[PDB]
Design a protein around this ligand. Structure first.
Ligand SMILES: [Zn+2]
Length: 227
């Protein structure tokens, strides 16, 4: 399918968005409504995700988290706003989105000419620190710069699942926005938290991994150019 939505543990589901370059995002089915983590690539992909959500739950989509300011994490924003979902990010992410959205859209369209020239749609709920949703069961935090300056992690303590959006994945990638030397230092700050982790969801490539995906990517980036 163009997109799948599949349970990994309890109320925590993984989105495999096979549009453009495959990106993986998360959905949390809560008691009052649904939290989406990663807005997906475009307003059209966001609509496709909503269609899948409505086959699982009748409860409203409450909010969507932009885990960074890039197109694969914020592209769906127009759709989510249109249905009355909050679009949530850190202040850092929101500020970078305002200044750099045109730049990231242009960069995206260099490799993906078919990708739409999306207008800026900013988060309307902005956090200055770490934050939680869903009665503390979805926990977002900053541990330093990596793939971008602003990318955040989202942890699901009940299910022991960690999502890092674009930060964690199988292949190195081309690193155009990355802080190559800080990247492993951010991964080590993450590991030093000693979070109970059974599952790490990679934001690209195949999503389902164990905690060792962190070590896998750390080793790749420590061997990279400019490391
Ligand atoms: Zn990405």
């Amino acid at each position: 399918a163009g997109m799948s939505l599949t349970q990994v543990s309890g109320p925590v589901y993984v989105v495999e968005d096979n549009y453009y370059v495959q990106e993986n995002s998360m959905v949390y089915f809560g008691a009052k409504g649904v939290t989406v983590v990663g807005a997906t690539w475009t307003p059209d992909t966001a609509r496709e995700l909503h269609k899948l959500i409505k086959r699982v739950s009748r409860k409203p989509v409450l909010e969507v988290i932009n885990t960074n300011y890039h197109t694969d994490r914020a592209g769906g924003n127009a759709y989510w706003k249109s249905i009355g979902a909050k679009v949530v990010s850190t202040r850092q992410t929101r500020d970078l989105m305002k200044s750099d959205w045109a730049e990231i859209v242009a960069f995206t369209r260099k490799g993906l000419p078919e990708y739409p020239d999306l207008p800026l749609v900013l988060p309307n709920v902005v956090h200055d620190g770490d934050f939680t949703l869903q009665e503390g069961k979805v926990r977002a935090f900053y541990a330093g710069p990596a793939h971008t300056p602003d990318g955040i992690f989202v942890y699901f303590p009940d299910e022991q699942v960690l999502y890092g959006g674009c930060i964690l994945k199988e292949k190195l990638g081309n690193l155009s926005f990355a802080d190559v030397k800080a990247y492993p230092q951010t991964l080590e700050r993450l590991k030093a938290m000693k979070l109970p982790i059974k599952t790490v969801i990679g934001g690209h490539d195949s999503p389902l991994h164990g905690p060792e995906l962190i070590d896998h990517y750390e080793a790749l980036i420590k061997a990279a150019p400019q490391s």
